[model samples]
Structure formats: C-alpha cells, structure tokens
Target: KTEEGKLVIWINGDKGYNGLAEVGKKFEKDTGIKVTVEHPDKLEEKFPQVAATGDGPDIIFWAHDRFGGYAQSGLLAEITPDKAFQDKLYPFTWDAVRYNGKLIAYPIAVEALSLIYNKDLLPNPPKTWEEIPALDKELKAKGKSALMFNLQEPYFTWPLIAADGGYAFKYENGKYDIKDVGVDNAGAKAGLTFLVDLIKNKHMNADTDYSIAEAAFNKGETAMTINGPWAWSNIDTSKVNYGVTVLPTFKGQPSKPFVGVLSAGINAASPNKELAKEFLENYLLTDEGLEAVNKDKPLGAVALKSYEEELAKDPRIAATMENAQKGEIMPNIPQMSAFWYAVRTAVINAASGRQTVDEALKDAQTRITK
Candidate 1:
C-alpha cells in the first residue's frame, strides 16, 4: 500500500463536481483510498500562493493555460501518462498539456471559439463572414443587425485579427519558440486591417464588449456571435435557439482561434503523489470515469479520441469538435503571459481611432517582445 491512502483534488467551479464526486466515491471504494474533491474560494489566486509553501490540494482541475507559470515555477509535477493513454488524444490536445517540452498536466476537454448563429432566424447558417452582408441588409429592415460580438475583446475577436496569418509564437521541435514573436507580422497586419474594415463599413461598431454582445444575441437581436462552449449557460437561459460551427473564413483563409484544454495536474507539494496519479490514471482518466463526470455537462470536445465520436452525437458538440482541429493550440509557455495585454491593447487602440491597425500591432509587438 502507498504511504498515504488519501488524495485531495481541487475543481475551479461549484456546479460540475457532482459527476466527478460520484466517480471519486467508486475510486475510494475500490482502492481503500479517500478522495476529497473541493471547489475552494480564490482558487486562481490560492493555488499558486498556497502551493508555493508546499501546502495545497494534491491535484488541480483547471485549464491547461493556467498551469504554465506553475509548471515553470516547479509548483506542478511532471507526469508521464502511459503512451497508450497519450495515444488517445490528438496532437493539439497533447500539445496543450505539455509546457517547455515536459508533460505538466493531463488533458480532458478541448475547446475553441466558434461561430454561433441563431437557428430561428436563419435555418441555414452562412458559410463565411462575406455571406453576412447580404443577410444584414434583410436584418436591417427588421430593425435588427445581422451579426454582433465582443469586437473590442481579443479572445472573442481573435479569428478576425488572425484570419490571414497572425500567431503568438513559433512552435517548433515540440515546443514554442517565445523569441519568434509574430504579433506584428504582415499577415497579422492584414488580418487586423480586415477587422477594422467592419467598423469602416458600419457592419460592426467599435463599442460592444462581451456583455453587450451576449445580451444582444440572447435578445434575438443579432443573427450570429463569436463565442465558445463556456457561454452555454447565458445562451441557454435566454432560450436562443442556436447552432455552433467553426469560424468563417476570411480572404479564403481559415480563421485561426486559440484552442484550450481543461486539464488536471498533480501538485508538486503533495506528499501522496503516487496515490494522486493512481486516481488520475487508474480511475479518473478512464472512459467510464469521464462518462460519469461528463453526464451533467457534456464537456464539448474531450481529448480522448475514442470518446469524441460519442460526444459528437450531440450536434453542438459535433460542430465544436470540428472547429477544434482548425484552431491553433494555446501555447503552454510562460512567455504566453505577454499575449493577452498586448493584443487587447492593440485591438482597443485600433478600434478607438487611437492608432492605425499597423501602428497598434507594431506597438503590441513591442509590448510583447520587450
């Protein structure tokens, strides 16, 4: 028997644990190990600060993006799940859990930004953004707009600003080259110029943030919006009949959004590392283990290839999974810290007339590299 027969796991949100809690009980029953799952307050803050003192949960259930700094700081333990288990995932899904050429976490679900359209308004959604202008003319007659989204936000607006060739870093040799920053390249400049054209044409104004865009869609005032699986709740409550699909192509190029994975990682501070790994591999990472946890929330596109077909039975999941392959895996590098602020600054600067798109991207590039 292991030295400790107990493991503690931390989940970020309160709502999705019931399913995992059920799985944990079975794990405890089968192994004589106690599994405690919790949703603690200040999770994002506490995990890093408390764990640095060698005191924190044995495992953390969160997005892979959040663990890069932790992994780099030695707060996360390096893991080697069996090659067969690794084989269950796609390359992009595998890429999400690996930081600095080391496996830092176990990936579960893959998610990316998608084009969500109102099914009630248009039975057949348009294939591309170019198709929206004709539809907008009709929507305009009804005192409504054809499309709307958080244009000022980088995360939601990434596809527009990267439809040509923008990217954060050059990923090669199984790791991201942070030194090769691409935020201000000609491809990025082209994409951002395309984004600003909407403002010039009055198809999209520069003012809408996430809340305004979400409200407009929920109110059935817009035909389409760009968002991800996380926004399912608000769309559900509003009863907006909708469908999700990959982002529309711009200038005949596929729109590139960042793909992220929700993953579980072992904490370096935990004394029961073996027991925690057992819970993740022998128990929690299995197909049955995932089904139990995924029952309440369908976990859109899971990493396991075997489970994708089953998950895709739901059209929403099918569409999202289709888009997952088309996205750039969110880089799991510590230098990724610089991306968010720089892109947002550029988007807001360009949109608000404070700078030209090229000027904004050039400034953003400098902000990231320096």
Candidate 2:
C-alpha cells in the first residue's frame, strides 16, 4: 500500500535486477506502498501469460526501442508526463521512449557503442574515418588487424550510415517518406565502400562472428572492435590494456552511434496504472533511484544531470556518455525491422563481393519497398 494505501509493484529479472530491488525497498519505505518485486527468470514465457490476462506487473523493465512494437500493438500502456515531469528528463532519453507522440516508456539508462582498442596495440586511436583505412593497412602489414565490426547487426551499421547524412527513412509532413534506402545515397555508399575497402585490403576479415571477435580481441589478436559498455566485464583488461574512444567521423561530422535506452514501462491493462505511475515516479525519477541504476547496471545514465560524480569515476561510463553526445537513438518504428534486414543484406552482399555496391543497395531498396 502506498502512503495512500495503494499497492506499488513490478515484475523483475535479468539485465538490471539489483537496481530494481534497491529501488523497490526505498520506494516501499518512502511511499508506504507494499512493493512486491516478483522475480521471473523466464520473462519471455511469463510476460505473455500475465499480460494476456490483464494481470501483468504494473511496470516492466525492457529496451525502449522494442517497447514500441508492444505499444503500437496495444500490449503496453500510453504514458504521458505533465510539463514539470517532462522537463525533468534528459531530452534524448525522453525522445527515444516516446512512440507516435505517446510517452510509452520511461528511460532508466542510455547506452552508446564505441571503438575500444588495446592501448598497447594502438598507442593512439584514429581520430578520423579517413585514417581508419590506412591504420588497418599498417596493422595488416604488421600481422595484426585493426578492428572487427559485426556485419550481422544493424544496430552497428545504422548509425555509421546516419553519420554520413544518410537515413533509412525521413519523416516529413507527419509521414515517413522514403528519402533513400540502402547504400545508394552518396553518404551511405561511402560508408559501405569504406567497409568493403577495409576487408579487401586484408585490414579486416568479413563475417567474423561475435564469439570469435570477442576471443580474438581479448587475446590481442585483434587490436580494436566497435563495441559498447556491455563488453567491459567480458574483456580481459589485465591481459591487454584497452581504452575506449568515440567512433571516427567523416569530414569532421560526428559518427553517430546506435543508442538504446533501457526503460521501465507501465502496462495499461494492469489494475494499478495510477499506482504503477507513482511507483515509476518515485523509483525511476529520483536522484537516489538513478544512483541505484548507475551502481547496479553501470552505463550512461538516462538523466544526464543526475549522476555526474558516479559516472566520472568509471572509464566505461565516462566514455559511453561522451560517445552518446554523438549518438542517435535507433528508430522505434515498426518499419525499422524491415529496414534492418534489408540494409544488412546489402552490406553483407557488398562485403562478400556477391554484388557491386550499387547493385546490392538497389536490390535492397527494391526488396524493402515491395
């Protein structure tokens, strides 16, 4: 029961559990709401069971981008903040969680990817995209490869293309307009050409899987990889010294990273929407709440102004925040799923010499439109 004797509760597990439990304790103490945090390891199997019966947890922790699919399908709640509460959130955080003008999720933390290099291998990381090709050449000559980028994940490529002023779709006149798709756009083509050139020159090996990439990087066989903070714990820093740096840009333009802000969203069908909102307000929006998140999960804080000191002490946290300044949150639109598969198909085909850059991109755009 809340101070007003309303029950405040949630379903919690994985990704950010400690943060949730800590916040739950504080929320119950402060608001006098009986906070029940039910732990379900198989949330994938359990959420549907609960949500279908209108007995789902009031609040759920999940990725902001994925939440849009649920919100648009009417499986999630429509959240709206008053002017005062809206003003309290970080601008980008707020923007990423909003779906079709409805605030459907509340961001708990934001994340950005960066080029992490072994300092022992590359004393100075390349500062520009143009320098990358040459650096790879030098590394290959020395029997070392410069970096590995996942060709399979659009989360990696989407932002690299965006940095060059390319986008999968453009919103104009309140509708999504297909300004251009795939590598056909000059900037998009340039990004693809750059990647292909790196592979052709033996600077990188195409089709490198994640497990191999991580192993190679940790073993110092590869000097750098485009990864995010999640890899920090996996990387063996003792065996090889590593440092994080922002992605290189083309012609001084910022290389935008694909960012994802993890969030807690209310279920509209829950019997306690108001109480859930109250739970989210006190547990997700407070300084103490943000601190717990930063402590337990440790990434870029969604509320940028709330946790400066905590972020400052950790290099991974600091670098991710700096990189996020140049980051673009991935689009939440349903069309994004189709865009992702199409764009990556074009990239993979081009990388493998299966088709010319133009042919690959043209095929991709055509396939997507149809």
Candidate 3:
C-alpha cells in the first residue's frame, strides 16, 4: 500500500478535513498507505449521488444521525465491531453505532444538546422545564432574556418535544412503527404549550439566532441557552462567568435530547474496503486517535469511557461529558428524511405566529404522509 494507493476519502467539510488529516498523516507515516482526502460543500447532496453510481471513496467521515438514511438506502456498509472494540465502547456510544441489529458507523465524537448558563447570573442550573418559566421571569425582571433558543431551528425544538415523552417514530419488533410522529401527543402538546406561554409572556424571544444567542449570552444579556460544546468554547469566560449542566430531566424522568455523533464508515462501492476498515480499526480505536480528536477539537469524543481520564485533567470536558448522558441518539430511520424538514417548517410557522402550534404540527404530519 504505497502513498499512491487507491484509497480516496470523502469528508464533510473543514472538520472532516482536519479529522481525517490527523489520521491520514499518521497512517501514511506508519502503514505506507497512500491516502487522498477531498472535502466538498453540500456533502449530503453529493455523497448519495456518488454512492448511487456504485463508485465512491474507500472511506468517509460523517455524522451518525444522517447515516440512518444512507444505511436504510443500502448506501453504506455495516462495520460490525468485534468483541475487543465492543468491550471498549461505552454502552450508549455502542448503541449509537448499532441499527437494525447491524453496526454501520464507528462514531468518533459524541455531541448532545445541553443547557449552558452564565455562572455569575445564576449560581444554580434549573432541574427541569417547569423551572424555566420562573427563571425567565426572574431574568426578565432584571432586563435579560430567560433563555436563548433559536425557535426557528428544528434542533432547538426537537429536544423539547423529546423531553415531553414524544418520539418521531417507534422502532419495535425489528420494524419502525409510526406512533405520535408529531407533537400531537398529550405530553408533546404540553411542551409546546409551555413554549407558547413563555413567548406570549415575554419570558423568551424567538428573534434570537445563533450569532445573537452567542453574543447575548457572552454580553450577559441572556442568562442561559440550550446549546452544545461548540458554544462553550466560542463564549468569552473572563468577562462573563459561565457553567454547563445536562438538560434538566422531566419530573425526574431523564429527558433525552437529540444527540449527534460523528462516525467513520467504509464506502460501500470502494474496491479497497478491507484496507479502509483496517486503517479505521487501527487509527480510530486507539487511545492516540481519541486524544487526537478531543484535544484538537472542543467537542467530546465518542469513546465515552475514555472521557474520564481526559476530563480529569480538563474540568470543562468533564462538564460536557456529564451533559452527554442526558441525551438520546437521534433516530436513523429513512422516514425521518421527510420528518426533519416538515418539523422545521412547523416550528418556524408556530414561532412566527403564522399558524397555531397544533395547525403547524398537523401540517407537518400531513406533509410526511404525502
């Protein structure tokens, strides 16, 4: 396997470029395997097209949430973890890689939506959604937004719906069974009702975008936000004190947020599948590979058990890791393909007052069925 060997890797964007580059450099140095990496925009559109042609890269790095559709479509190859790798993986992390009794993706990093707050403003974090309203009232009385959530983004709302005991689809008996696919369920409706009341009472604002939320929180204009680790790094701590915690549970029942995992997979159409798997098995499963990713990036690694040693040295990593436990891996169902866009449309419509929450959600459900 020379440096000119037939392994071409496709990555998502800059993150993919950097992640793969780290391993490629080491792989070339040690194994003499020639690797070429390409990162393209609109990867979601491009990867499937290439896979459809039955001539794609030898390997690719992508998020696990999106892999469900690709796997269901026969666009990905299952990477079954042997006993050694399986024993090393954290239980939840292992579950993320397994779908339909087949392992398709080897997760590199784990991310979940959790609550981040300014420590100086409120020394203690709320324990549940019910506390948010009262917290908001207190913050607003002091001339601050109670929380920061992009009411326009589906990512922000999806967790709330989940916490309320709602699901996009139910997978049981080895098949996906649709049950309460929308927020029409009693619990989900209750969650949305809370949101509507918060907005109406001016406890929260839907006008906040990602930039605005980040800026406001750093400026101490907002007290808290349901954000991930990326926001943790980008905020200025010296000027404003900050801390993070797992999203509060619902009445002591663990509320599961939509979690995103970055996983590596061998290309189905690649001729060098065996070699690609060998490279991934050696580089991605080692302690060096885990450290390389966690140290280089602020996000936590998918090797959940490994997090303890690394977090012991850096308390912030520990904080994020604690938050990860409160999340659920977002489903990989193919039908979810139509659900995401529909849900986002519904959320935006409801937030903007263009339609009632029920109407918006009903429209989304109908769109999915169509």
Candidate 4:
C-alpha cells in the first residue's frame, strides 16, 4: 500500500534521536511514507507553541509526564492501544501514558532513581535509610562520605517522602485529585526530618548539588549516591565499579522513587493523525523497532515485555528494570508542574534549617493549594 503525505517527527538531538532516525528510515522504506525527523532546540517549550497553532509535528518524542498537560489542553491525540498491545508492556509504563483514563502516548522506556554504589567501598548496599548513619561514621573514618545526592532537588528527595507515605497528588478513579496534596503530611514530615538530620550530622550537606554529588561519586569521594540511568553517561566506569539497586527502605517501607517513562505521542492537530497512529502503534512498538531505539543509547529499560528477556541480558538494563518495578509511577497531571517548585523549596528550607520541617512543608502545601 502506498502511503501519501509526509510524516514529521520531533525528537531531541541526542543518541536516542540517532536511534529513532534509523527506525524512521525503515518505516519510510516499508510504508512508502516520507519521514522527517526534526530536532527542535527546546522541544518541550516549542511543541506547545507550535501545536496550539496547528503546525506541530505529527508525532513528538518526549517524557510521559508532559502527556497529561498536553492531553488536558487538547494538544495530544487520545491513543488507545488494544489490550493485546497494552499487555506487552509493563503496567506502570501504561499508567504513565494515561491521562483521565485515556492513553496519551506510546511508552518507550522506563527510568527511575536507583542507588548507584561504589562496589569496592560498599560490597553490600544499605537495606534501610536508618543504616546510612552508621555507614556514614564508618566511611568518614576512611575519608569518604557515606551517601551524597542533590539535596536541593525535590526529585531526588521525593523517594524519602514517598517511602514515608507521602505523595504529590492522590491518584483515584483513573485521575489525579490535585486538591489532595500529601506533601506536608506527618509521614512526609518524618521523611523530611530524616533528610535534615543527615545534613545536621554532616552525612551530606545542602550544598551538595547534582554536579558535586556526581563528581564525588565518580572521584571515589563518596561511597554511594542516589541517581538514575542518566548519570551513567557522566560516570567513568573505569574508575568506579558502580552497582545499581533500589533505594534503601525508610522506616521499613520501600523507597518509592518516581518512575519516569519516555514516550511518543501523536499531536491532536496533526493532519496525518491516522498515519501517526499507525506509525506509533504498528511500527515503533515492534521488537525490532524498539531494539533500534535502544541500540545506541540503552538509556533505560524497554517498555515492551516482549523485549524484557533480550534487554535483561545487559546487567545495567536489568538493574534499572528491577528498580522501576519497585517504584511509584510519576504522576503526569499538570498540577505536578506546580508540585515540583513547592516541594523543592520545602526540602531546601528544611535541609538548611531555615524552617522546621512542618513549617517548610506547610508552606509548600499552602503554595500548592493556591
């Protein structure tokens, strides 16, 4: 069958884009459709502007968290993958692409924060957050920090709060209730207190941002760090024999890190909606197509269950998949944009002792509610 009209695709100009371009070539050859892969400088910001004016690409590759916002604004086409197709992916990945009970994107990969440790320094990773204090003392004697991470960033701090039963918005009945913000609950306060205590005891400091934490871990100054698969690019495996695992539990509860999904979505305003849907569901979701996307940059675990056996062959990918299984899906609601700033400030304020945990989080709750 001869397909007419050009199908434009927007993806970040990175290793993943290179992989996508290769697949686009196959897609064009097989379907007789012209595929143009474009990389905008700021896709997240540019997509909304162009899509609103009815000039966006037919399909855009991005994180699933943006799907909710785009779908809510009628910027994305509601994509309903049949049960057979949906059954081939991890359930959490499917959850990431849904907005108000409708699928908004095709999940490609799964990512979540996991504990990356210097295996030589820590043969056994801590089982719980409480163990870090004793570990810190032991490591300090050897001129090393026990744990280090971006304390100022809420994304990194979220696991602590989540492990203690905190959540950004309550997920109920196939939608997120924005009014039910749980960032300042008692459990969240306990988690925040644990983090502040780490700073007060010199385990880690508020000054240790992403760069510093990454540098320290890579340079062997820190025994372990809470980071994700993206950090693998910066780490020199030659110098650091790192091992990946789930974050330690807090107060006997699992550290529920935010699971993020990279996905592709059809633009609602696209003239080639049928072709776009066909390309995503039929072509890109295949085992061979997904392999091409992951070939250059195995950035995260493939979302397809059919590829799990193949992907698990790589130790790094296996570790990431394991962590993702234990993580909570990052809520994709538009309110989550407001959630980041509020909770980030709360974490920072509490960590720096500028305000009590309760005070800092209460301020965050107030901001989010307003």
Candidate 5:
C-alpha cells in the first residue's frame, strides 16, 4: 500500500503534455493519492529498460506503437476494459493496443499522415500523385519547391511507399507476420523508385529531413508537405494560409498511411498498478480530463465517442480523422524496432545513390530478418 500512496506517470513534455500535470493535481485532491506527472528524456527507451527490472513510472502516456516492445518484454500490464467502456471509444483505436486478444493500453487519440498545403500557393490540394508534376513545374517557375517532406523518414514516406504494396510487417490472424517482409516486394520497389524519380525531377529536395521540411513549409518556402496534427502548432508560428486533407493518391491507388494511437499503460512491475489504473479511468479518461488536456495541447483525432461531436467542429481535426479512417493501424510488434532501424539504413542508402532501390530494400529486408 505504500507504493499505492503515489502514482507516477510519464509524458512527452516536448508535446506540451502539461495537461496531464493539471489532471494529476485534480486526482490527488479527489482521491488523496499523490499523482506525479514527470517528463523524462527518451521515455520509450528508458521506461522499457527500467521497468524490465521492476522499475520506472507506474504509467506512461505515449504512442501505442511503442507498446509492442513492452508487451513482448512483459514490462507492461494489460488493463481490460469493460464492454460498455470499449463501446464508448473509437473502435479502431483498440487495434494498436490488442495483442493475442488482450488489451494492453487505454488509447486517447489517433493521428495519420495528411497532405498540408498552403492555400496561397496551392489553392487546391492535389487529388492524385500525377498532379504533382504540373504543380512541381509551376512551382519551379516561381522559384519554389513544389513539396517537401522528410522523405527518408519512414513514417512520412509510408503513405507513398505503401500505397501500392509495401509494409514493414504484415498484420494477419490477429498478430504480425514478421517473416512476410513485404517492404522489399515488387510494389515497394516501384513506390521507392517513384520517390527517387521525384527527387531526380527536383520536385522534392534530396537532403530534406523532418526539421528541414517543417521549417521550409512553415516559412512558405514549399507549397505543400505530408504532415499531421502534431505539426500544426509549430507551423502556425509562420502565419501561412494552410489546409489539411488526405494525402494524394499514388498511381491512382489510395495512400494508406499508418495510424498512430496515443495510449497510456501501467507498468507491470509497479506496486501501484491498480491505483494507476484507477487514476487513468477516473481522472484521465473523463470528458473533463480530456478537455483540460486538449487545452494544453490540441489532441490529434480524439478517440472517445463523447468528444466526437465537438472534435468535428474543427475542420483540421476532422480532416485528420478522415485520413485516419484510410490508414491501417501501425503495427505494434516487437519486430518494429528492427523494421525502423533497417528501413532507415535503406532510405539513406537509396537516397544517397550508394545503392539502387532494389538493392537498398532487399538489404533492408535482410537486415530486418537478422
């Protein structure tokens, strides 16, 4: 019970998650149980390492994508929701937290890749990838880049690469088929090659990364980019006229980006696991709690049904959720770690011309296998 005297939670302060700090204060007042919301560096890395040894915060608020690592390591506890509670939340959010038919997290929000365009430069966002070439030429005439995203960043490029037939790990039979390795298949090769062609044609910068793309788009230096809800605040600083929409189709195929769910999980090793669950269910999942949190940082597509009406009142959040509908839930598999690392190497190799697209992806698949 001594450990139950306090419930500590971790959040990414970089995203202005102090909203949880306010909820912590309210929970302490109501339950007389101390609640501390702490922001730590590299929480995804640190929490798993510490909790494996019976350490780390009682609860962690993070993207559901990271939970697979903890679930496989037995570092996160499963919190089964009642039928009523499950029915009250967005159904899609559950996919990210479920493993082997067990729920390992309480999802709070959803996010997906969206094509963000400057209305001043591109009054109408492109509907298909083919339109990009005309826009690219028009923008070039005006001495501007048509678009720029962190092309080498797997997350940003996923909608394009996966539009046809690419995937990090195939999710099947209620589990990830890690051995499938579709990232190097024929469709994937065609997708990556299309991107390389874009660079060669000068539509997107070869050297652009996340920071470069964000700054360029914000400064009105680029006409468009593939970003999501998280970039809105940063982009607003530049006073550009912008709009958000589902990404353009690729080769006439709908772009299928990955939907990332933000969720909270209790540390399996924590003595206060039950109390932490109480804090999450009683303090964090409530409408009041979500509203307070949203005030501090505009939440991505809110997953709770109670907020649906209000969430749609804002066109941007609505557009994000629309895109979320088109995206597959990002795989929450332990192999995702290897997938990301290998894909990064492949991206760098292909982008640098050190290896052709075929060779780069084949090496990535092999690296992922190893």
Candidate 6:
C-alpha cells in the first residue's frame, strides 16, 4: 500500500546511486510514500540470498546482465510496462531487459565500448584495424605510444574477437545455446593472432593494466585507448583532449562491443510491488527523473527517446549511442560464468606467448565445455 510507511531500494555503491537517492526523495514528496535507498557492498552476492528470503529491498537497481539468473530463480517479478512506454525505449534496450521473453526490468541507460582518442594527437580516428599499426609507427616516432589498453581484460579484448565473427554463445530461439562456444573458432583465432602480433612487435604492451592504460591516456602518453563511459569520469579533460567514436572495423566488419544496460527491477517477494512499479514507471522513467539521474552522473546513452535528441548534441553521447546500436547484448545466462574465466586465461596466455593462439583457445573451449 502507498501507506506502507517506506519503500526501500537497494543499489550498488557508485556515482549513480547518489543520483537515484535524490530521485527517491522527489518520489517520496510526490506520492507521500517514503523511499529509502541503500548501498551495500558485495551487492551481487548478497542480493540473491536476501531476495529469495523476502528480506531484500522493494527494488533492486543494477545491470541487466544479472537479471536472467534472478528471474529464473523467482527473485524478480515480471514487469510489463505499457505499450506506449515500451515503444518509447530503443528496441535493443527492451531486448536487453527481457529474460525468456518476459520483461524483468526497466532499462534506464545503455553502455558500449567505443574508440576514445586524444583529438589533438590523432586528427582522425582509424576507420579500420589495419590502420592502427601505421598510426602506432607514426606516434612512436614522436616519442609517444599510439594505443594502450588493459590487455589482460577479456571485456576489452572480446570486441576484437566479435569483429571477426566470434561470440561467447550462439543466441537462438530466445535462449543462449551454451554448447556452441565460439572462443576457439577460426574467427577468434584470427583475432587473437592479430593481438598477439601487436604485443610481440611492441606496438602494444601486454603488461598495461587498467590503471596504467587509463593513466597513460590521461597524461598524454598514449594517443588513444579502448574504454567505456565509466572511464570518462577518471579522464583529466583539461590535460587530455579526447573524442569518442565507434571502434574501427576488422576485415570490413564492425568491431561489435557488448552493450550493457543499467536497469531497475522489482523484487518478487516485496510487499511494495505496486508501489515500486509506480515509482519506476511513472517517476524514474519520466523525462524529469532521467534528467535528474543524468545530471548527477552522465550515463553513456539513456534509454528514453525524449532524451536522445538532447544527448545527441554531445558528440561523446552520440558516439556511445551509435556504437550501442551496432553492438550485441551480452548473454545473461548462468552458463556465462564458465565462459569468462576460460576466455580470460586463453587471451592472456596467447598474448604473452605462453601458448600458441590455437592451443590456448582450444584449451578454453575444452574448459568451457567441461
């Protein structure tokens, strides 16, 4: 009931959570229902257990990728926003929130990896992967590194594999077919070989971790880096004149990044289900609510159509939206747990020459299957 005293929302401790708290305050004033937003460490691990026992918050806000497991476990209530509301969101946004054809969450923002470059150093970003080596050479002669990224991280490396027609799993008939792992396929091998060659030739350093890559780009030590919107905050805008664009193609194919959506879901066991739905659909999804949220912390590309025109005015937001439109949604199935570790090990081993690309990838596939 609206008179239930208070409606609780659980969120991860991030910049966005504070924005959500502000929105909750406004929601309380409007509906006379108190709203409490709490951030708990280890949310991903804590949520499932608490939710199953009906001890969680009325709403849980997080990324869409984790929703499938919760929905399958009966931790999330099926959410069906009105057709008008649903139609206003980008098609991919809707797809990202769906689990087995049922809407389990309301998507608020979309994020995808894009080519963020130092505009002053690279007047024009590369349109193809083939151009990176030449650009690397050009930058090296100037006593600067051309490109740098977290080489050991699979999330950043997967775009290359996807560009060559590789995917973690084949999504078919409304579900991911885990048996059809693509990490060890020919396309993935070609992608891995390209990365290995770059490391072997010193065009890119295999030792560059996330902090190193971020610092290098911020300090003008690197011309460009592959990262996402979250990195935008860490960047020293005054020092690094940056521009965002979609990743270059590989062999005439778009380097498809994984698109992730931040969404809000209602707990199935919560007594305040209706109140949560009202707050999410009527207030949080509204233009004013989204504006408040973005004002606090700018997301890549918001899911609302009303905000698209305004956001497109910013080249960074426009680039992110364009890349997201061309990207693929990451699978949210439990089988994905097996995919990440196997691929990360394979990627690191191949890049370091600890194992041949073919051998490392073959072992990854074997591990994924087991």
lDDT of 4: 0.62
lDDT by residue for model 3 over 1-370, one digit each (tens)? 4544446666644354566577767766766755677764666676567765545354656676555446545656665557546557567766645566766666665555555555566636556657877887887787766765444454555655655645564333334455446445666677676656656566445566776656666564465655544444542235355456665666434444444566567656355566567656666656676556555655554454655565555435445467555445555456656666666665666666556767766655566566
Per-residue alpha-carbon lDDT of model 1 for 116-156, expressed as tens digits?
Answer: 65656563556666787888898788777776665555444
Candidate lDDT (C-alpha), each: 0.61, 0.59, 0.58, 0.62, 0.62, 0.63
Sorted by lDDT (best first), the order is 6, 4, 5, 1, 2, 3
Using TM-score as the yardstick, the better of models 2 and 6 is: 6
lDDT of 1 at 287: 72
My TM-score estimates for the predictions, one after another, are 0.72, 0.69, 0.73, 0.75, 0.74, 0.78
Instruction: Give me the overall lDDT of model 5.
Output: 0.62
Rank by TM-score (best first): 6, 4, 5, 3, 1, 2
Pairs of colliding residues, candidate 6: none
lDDT of 2 by residue, 1-370 (tens): 3344333244443446666666656655866644455554665576667666544355555676565556546666676668446556466656645556776665666555566655566746556766766777888997887765454454555555656655565334324455454335776777767656756666445656767556666565465666553454432245456567766667546545555666566666365676566656666666776667656755555555655556565565666677556445555455666766666666667676656678867666676567
The digit string of per-residue lDDT tens for model 6 on 213-290 reads 567666754657655545544322453565676666777675555556665667673656665676666767667777
Which candidate has the top score in lDDT? 6
RMSD of each: 5.0, 5.4, 4.9, 4.7, 4.8, 4.3
Candidate 2 minimal-lDDT segment of 10 residues:
5-14
Whole-model lDDT, model 3:
0.58
Spell out the clash pairs found in candidate 2: 1-33, 1-34, 2-6, 2-33
* Cα lDDT tens digits for candidate 5, 1-370: 2333566666754654566667656656655656676775776577556766545346666776565444545656665667546556655666645677766665666655566665565646556767876887887886787765555555556556765656654434435554576776777788777767766667534666667756776675575765554544432344356566666666546655555666666766366655566656667666776667667777464665666777776555666577566456654455656556666666666666556776766665666567
